[PDB]
Amino acid sequence: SIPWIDNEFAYRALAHLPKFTQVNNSSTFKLRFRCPVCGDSKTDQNKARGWYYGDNNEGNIHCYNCNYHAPIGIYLKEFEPDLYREYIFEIRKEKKKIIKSLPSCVRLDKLAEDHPIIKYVKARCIPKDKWKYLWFTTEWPKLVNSIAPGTYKKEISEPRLVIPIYNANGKAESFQGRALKKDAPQKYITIEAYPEATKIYGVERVKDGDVYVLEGPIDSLFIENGIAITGGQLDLEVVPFKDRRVWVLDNEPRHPDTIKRMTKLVDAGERVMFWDKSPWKSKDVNDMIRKEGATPEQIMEYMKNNIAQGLMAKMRLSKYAK
Amino acid sequence: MVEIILSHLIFDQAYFSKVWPYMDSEYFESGPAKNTFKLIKSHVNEYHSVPSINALNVALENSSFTETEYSGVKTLISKLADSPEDHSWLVKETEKYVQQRAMFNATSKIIEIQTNAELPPEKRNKKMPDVGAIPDIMRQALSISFDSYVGHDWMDDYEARWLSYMNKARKVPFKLRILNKITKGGAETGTLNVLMAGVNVGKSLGLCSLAADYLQLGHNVLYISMEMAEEVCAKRIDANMLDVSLDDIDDGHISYAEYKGKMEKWREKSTLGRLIVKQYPTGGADANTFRSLLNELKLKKNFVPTIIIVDYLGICKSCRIRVYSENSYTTVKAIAEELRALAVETETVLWTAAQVGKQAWDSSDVNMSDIAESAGLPATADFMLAVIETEELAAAEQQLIKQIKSRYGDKNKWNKFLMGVQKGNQKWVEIE
Amino acid sequence: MVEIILSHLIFDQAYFSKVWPYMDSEYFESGPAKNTFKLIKSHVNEYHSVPSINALNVALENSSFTETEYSGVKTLISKLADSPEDHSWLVKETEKYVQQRAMFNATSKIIEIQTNAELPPEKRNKKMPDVGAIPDIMRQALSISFDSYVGHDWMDDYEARWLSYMNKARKVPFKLRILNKITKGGAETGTLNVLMAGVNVGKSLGLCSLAADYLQLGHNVLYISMEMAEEVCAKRIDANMLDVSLDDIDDGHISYAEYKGKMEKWREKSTLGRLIVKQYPTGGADANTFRSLLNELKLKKNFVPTIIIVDYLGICKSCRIRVYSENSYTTVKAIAEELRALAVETETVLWTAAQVGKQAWDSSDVNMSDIAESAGLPATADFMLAVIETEELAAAEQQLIKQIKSRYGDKNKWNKFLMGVQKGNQKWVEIE
Amino acid sequence: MVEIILSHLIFDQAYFSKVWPYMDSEYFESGPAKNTFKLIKSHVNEYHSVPSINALNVALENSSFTETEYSGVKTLISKLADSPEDHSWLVKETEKYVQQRAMFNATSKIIEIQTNAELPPEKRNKKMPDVGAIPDIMRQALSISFDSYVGHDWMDDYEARWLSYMNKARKVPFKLRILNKITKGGAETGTLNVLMAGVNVGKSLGLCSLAADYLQLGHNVLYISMEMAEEVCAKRIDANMLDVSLDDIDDGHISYAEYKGKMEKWREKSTLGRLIVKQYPTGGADANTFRSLLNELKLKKNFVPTIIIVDYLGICKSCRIRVYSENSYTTVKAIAEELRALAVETETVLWTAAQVGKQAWDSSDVNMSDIAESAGLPATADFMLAVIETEELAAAEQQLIKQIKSRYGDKNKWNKFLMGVQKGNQKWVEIE
DNA sequence: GGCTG
DNA sequence: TTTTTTTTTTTT
Ligand SMILES: Nc1ncnc2c1ncn2[C@@H]1O[C@H](COP(=O)(O)OP(=O)(O)OP(O)(O)=S)[C@@H](O)[C@H]1O
Ligand SMILES: Nc1ncnc2c1ncn2[C@@H]1O[C@H](COP(=O)(O)OP(=O)(O)OP(O)(O)=S)[C@@H](O)[C@H]1O
Ligand SMILES: [Mg+2]
Numbered sequence A: 001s002i003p004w005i006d007n008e009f010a011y012r013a014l015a016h017l018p019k020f021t022q023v024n025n026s027s028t029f030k031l032r033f034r035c036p037v038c039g040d041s042k043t044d045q046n047k048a049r050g051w052y053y054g055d056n057n058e059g060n061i062h063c064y065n066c067n068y069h070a071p072i073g074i075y076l077k078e079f080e081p082d083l084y085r086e087y088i089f090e091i092r093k094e095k096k097k098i099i100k101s102l103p104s105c106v107r108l109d110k111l112a113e114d115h116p117i118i119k120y121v122k123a124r125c126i127p128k129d130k131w132k133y134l135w136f137t138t139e140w141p142k143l144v145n146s147i148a149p150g151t152y153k154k155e156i157s158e159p160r161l162v163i164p165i166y167n168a169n170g171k172a173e174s175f176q177g178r179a180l181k182k183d184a185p186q187k188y189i190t191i192e193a194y195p196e197a198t199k200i201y202g203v204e205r206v207k208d209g210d211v212y213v214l215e216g217p218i219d220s221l222f223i224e225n226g227i228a229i230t231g232g233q234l235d236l237e238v239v240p241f242k243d244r245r246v247w248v249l250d251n252e253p254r255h256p257d258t259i260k261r262m263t264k265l266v267d268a269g270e271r272v273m274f275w276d277k278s279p280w281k282s283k284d285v286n287d288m289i290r291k292e293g294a295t296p297e298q299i300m301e302y303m304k305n306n307i308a309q310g311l312m313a314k315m316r317l318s319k320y321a322k
Numbered sequence B, C, D: 001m002v003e004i005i006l007s008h009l010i011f012d013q014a015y016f017s018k019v020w021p022y023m024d025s026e027y028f029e030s031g032p033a034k035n036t037f038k039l040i041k042s043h044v045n046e047y048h049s050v051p052s053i054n055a056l057n058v059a060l061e062n063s064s065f066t067e068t069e070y071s072g073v074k075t076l077i078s079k080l081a082d083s084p085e086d087h088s089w090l091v092k093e094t095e096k097y098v099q100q101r102a103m104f105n106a107t108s109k110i111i112e113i114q115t116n117a118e119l120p121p122e123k124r125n126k127k128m129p130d131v132g133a134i135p136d137i138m139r140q141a142l143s144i145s146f147d148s149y150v151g152h153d154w155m156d157d158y159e160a161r162w163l164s165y166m167n168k169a170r171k172v173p174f175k176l177r178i179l180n181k182i183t184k185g186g187a188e189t190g191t192l193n194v195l196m197a198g199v200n201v202g203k204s205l206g207l208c209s210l211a212a213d214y215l216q217l218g219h220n221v222l223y224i225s226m227e228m229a230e231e232v233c234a235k236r237i238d239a240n241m242l243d244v245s246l247d248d249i250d251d252g253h254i255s256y257a258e259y260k261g262k263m264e265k266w267r268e269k270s271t272l273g274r275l276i277v278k279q280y281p282t283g284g285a286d287a288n289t290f291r292s293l294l295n296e297l298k299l300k301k302n303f304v305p306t307i308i309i310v311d312y313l314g315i316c317k318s319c320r321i322r323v324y325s326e327n328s329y330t331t332v333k334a335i336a337e338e339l340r341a342l343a344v345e346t347e348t349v350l351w352t353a354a355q356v357g358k359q360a361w362d363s364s365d366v367n368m369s370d371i372a373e374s375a376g377l378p379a380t381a382d383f384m385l386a387v388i389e390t391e392e393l394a395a396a397e398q399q400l401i402k403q404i405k406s407r408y409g410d411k412n413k414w415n416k417f418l419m420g421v422q423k424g425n426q427k428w429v430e431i432e
Numbered sequence E: 001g002g003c004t005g
Numbered sequence F: 001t002t003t004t005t006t007t008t009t010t011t012t
């Protein structure tokens, strides 16, 4: 198919749609908009469940409200035949910033031992030394607007735990804020100094031997050579130590997305971790530590004797499925 | 009370043996309870015994479920515990819960039926019952009690059988004594009775005469005609009942005054039923069509027939068969089986007609091997009759009946009785 | 839809007289519509006539309603429509509206009954019907139809049926005295009538004679030909109508002047019908293509026929069989059934012809047993006329017509009759 | 389920006897489970008896491991309880667990072999097998089970086969001396027996007589009828058992005193079984429907049949072939195979009836080639009898039961034997 | 703030 | 919509 011309035609046709958004990352062409087929959610007028994907082999539209999915050509012919004919004829026609200041931030290692967040991190059972990499803020929106103005409409006083993300050079080019309260718009609000900032945590702290890729940076704290891809799309290329890295996901065997990711990793022949014999059964490492009492050295012992790759990984995954 | 039901299924043999055969997965919920009951039912199917807690939470729950379903099932299984309750209150409460859940499911189903039928065609979700069969679903939901009624025990149910014998609550007597002395009281309710006559020998004079007799006997008669219009069949019935020749109604020798007088004389009699004639195109009506017609008659005209007369069995179509078959053996047999199933479902005496083979034409005797369309039709019929008036009986206004297959009695007792046909009045009279 | 219903209750007579007995207050609403209908019903009860707008407003003024009710009723009364919609659509749409509202009310009532049933027995309403009344209630919702016509009801349609016998509503005359004599007034609508041709008997001569006779009587005739083109069949029709011999047209004896003069003379007569000749390839026309042809003629040509004449039954194709054979019994039986179904569903007289059996060919007398189509044509044919052409009859320009199957009347009344066949003009004349 | 396996190894005894030989240390784990199983195996090797919990603690004390795992092992032996689970489920679950672990170990071994093969020969491991051993070892993991017997060995199992000869354990006598003589002990369990005859000849009569004879021999007989109603079959059984003619029941020549007296006289017998008569629509029940019926009969009452009389297999439907997808031959063969599979599964004698062809309806002799529908039904049947009735036989109240197929004896020793048939009593009597 | 096939 | 095996049935 012809992705670029389809993307252009979809852009022309859907420029006028409600909630139209040009959600285009560095490698994908997605358009977010309110689904004209169903008007998206009747209750929520700000929902834009109409999505066009040009990254797909053929730019395809799908609504998450009316569950209407089709190619761009089908929608164009069934809704705008006028430009559809011109498009179908065209078918054969073609034929960096570094964060330097920490306003309203007090590092946990230098924070007072009586601070409530210190007590919470004790409930989180984080190693004391790791506190020299985490700050606490009472003015997270204020701090972000001080560093990146216009981010927050109001600089409300919100206490969060700020983990700066240091590049291999050790330069904080981003930061993730964890809301202390159980209720929040997002558990981990991550803001980067520049769009090309590193999405991998602990890169500056990588040592010799195998490197363990985890989910949460706090989880990586308990682990030597623990790096954390800070959200985003899992891309092998952006990940260093492509020779020696070790994949460690959450212990959620019945969860479908986790096993999908693990299948993706193993099909790339990677070296992954398996929990099919773990004495603890919590979802993640920190949960095993705080609940099952799991201690980090036992965890490392288990993991160094549970890494599998290739056919070994595949067969050990089959059993771990369910 | 799902938790109590599950707990006493696991931890009570008497309660299990009492309530398990009436348990269904569509009674508990769309969450943990349904999954737990699925595990229990799978274990009972596989091993014919009630599972324990270990079997539930290891041998069965360690299979395939999402995280939320797994957590719910684990919590429910851990919550199960034996509780001392009387085994008369538990059964009654479980029966009430089952009845309530059956009613809830039936209400949801009929709501979905109405919603589906409200939608226009091409999106009507076929195989879903029509709006006509809403009350039967509710009636089925009402009778969902825990009573053991599987079949007819010979020794345990002889009282009801004797009541049926003494009441004779299966026979529908004829108006002809000759047909009653060979059927031992007439035809039975769930039966398929057949006439075989040939071409222009009868085969609708006989059906019309039987319909007229049943009408005079107070029965509701439904005449489904595939080969004749409603008006011509009603004219034959009028000739039979008004004692007027069929030609006289055509030439015009009968006045409107006497016609209306005879009709009103018949109306005032309390011993007169209702005859409804419905025509379908030749080859365009099946058992499903007849069921739809019955439902429409019951809803609109409040008409529940006791006699159903199909003018011709061989020019109908099979509801089960989807692709037309050139083999007349299978199609006619399927049609006859469907008609007899309809008769036994509606408890209606079903009369129909069959065509004899060309060899039997102008033959003084017609054997069962002269059936034309299919040899499976005589196997499914409860009573067959053959009309063999060749040449001399026509001059004497007679017809000879052979009694080829008789399931009401011995067909070798009174094989021939020489019925008195009258073609002008379209009726049968005896030779007493 | 409620606005239209109220407007055409106020401003119509036939609609009122048709839909008033099936109109209830609970069918409309719980707001302005219900109040307006209550006003209408009160006025019609106190004064047995449809109220006017001024009278309706006076009644609303002298009524007990609050401010919001007063405003709603006033607005609705001011919003009435006197538009003259078509009656059939109006009746059907109001019937659908009434049925939907009745179903909704019944479903709500059964839900309320179930909810009341699941309440402390000491604490429940006594007026609420028991659960066992649920299946009956829904039945009353399904028994709502403005007009009940399911089949022909004996003793309930005797006055309409008599008007059929006196008015001969079904008969279509023949223009030949002998054929009218043996059919008691001609052939009937929704029938299949066939001609059996023996030795030296063309099948299309008789069909063209019948088509011409029907054309002269004012009937719309659709002639579907298989083995011949449209021009050839219409040339046979011209030979019969213009009195020109068939060979004279090919030779050129008749000039354009005489042809046009005769055609315009026929066109002047108001007792002439329309003839539409449609050609189909051999075996390429089943009795489903004819339905499409009729639909196209009705939509485009506005031509709705009363007579359909198929050139030859054997050449046709059975839609049910799909597989085709030059001379196979199963196909002929299916073709006859499909054509008779088409005749019944279109209310038209359908004519066709077949070849008699070889033994029938040699014998001047033709027996139903002596027929190429045995038990297939003398089972689906209302009338089967047999045509015999021997050497002596041909020398006298005659053909012996024998009646082999007559559903219309007695087959043996006038079985044999001599017909004056003219093979040049393709005509049948009577014999004194 | 390693905890359950270890607990029932230590405590349960028969489970230990059945499962211990098929136990290896590689099947459990690489952690506490493996250590516990190694301790148990060492103890059972030292002392040829199952150890106790105190013995396990002593073995842990004297034979020690590294404390890291030793704590896990000592906390692993704190949960092994008696937990009296059922034996069959425990054995099946242990077999499934060991099979799964064997498959996992085989896959890991073949992966390791492939990895070793990739390595250069300089540093490759020597203990690992070559790649050529990958298939066979996989087979060694495929054929792992607890079934010590894979088949029947002629010389090894000469014992336990002579037991089947002393005690028949298969034969069910017929209550008729002639049938026992021609069968050498009666019909066998897990067999399909067929009575073939023409239409209206006695097939249901013979089946009812057999059912009555079995009922008199203390047998549970389940009569499944596809055509006749339950009351009709029960009336035939009453006529056979109560020595009252069918005419007497339909003419009122028997009083309620006689009927109840005879029924209670039969009830007082200790040599009487149970007869459940079940009715299904024609063509609306299959082998799975029969299995569901048997399950509900076993649950809702203490009824496990030993004789199953299906009225006619030809009017059933296959549980594998879709409806009317195949011809008569394939469908009837599939139905017969399904019925025989049901018979062998339930270990019951299954009697049924079949129709003969149209050509054998008036024949004094019936051959195996006269079977209607499939010819695979004689192939699937274990015992087939042909019921022949002629005018001379009917004049003497006799039939001509002929052996068509016999897997119980030589069909030629007594091929044709006369049998008196009382049609009024629906009874078979033997000429003596 | 993402999430489809 | 044709094609080919096998069977079963029926009609001539
Ligand atoms: N209008 C009539 N007047 C007098 N006799 C009639 C009339 N119609 C039919 N008959 C006679 O009734 C018999 C015809 O049988 P019907 O009851 O019409 O059914 P059928 O004709 O045998 O069925 P088929 O399939 O059409 S042959 C013959 O004996 C006719 O002579
Ligand atoms: N209800 C009955 N009343 C009197 N005699 C009967 C009755 N049913 C059967 N008979 C007699 O028993 C004979 C055989 O009947 P059945 O054995 O039931 O027949 P079948 O083998 O099931 O075949 P069908 O059903 O008749 S095609 C009949 O021909 C009659 O002589
Ligand atoms: Mg007829």
Ligand SMILES: [Mg+2]
Residues within 6 Å of the ligand: D203, D204, D227, D228, D311
């Ligand atoms: Mg029977």
Ligand SMILES: [Zn+2]
Residues within 6 Å of the ligand: A035, A036, A037, A038, A039, A040, A049, A063, A064, A065, A066, A067, A068
């Ligand atoms: Zn949408």
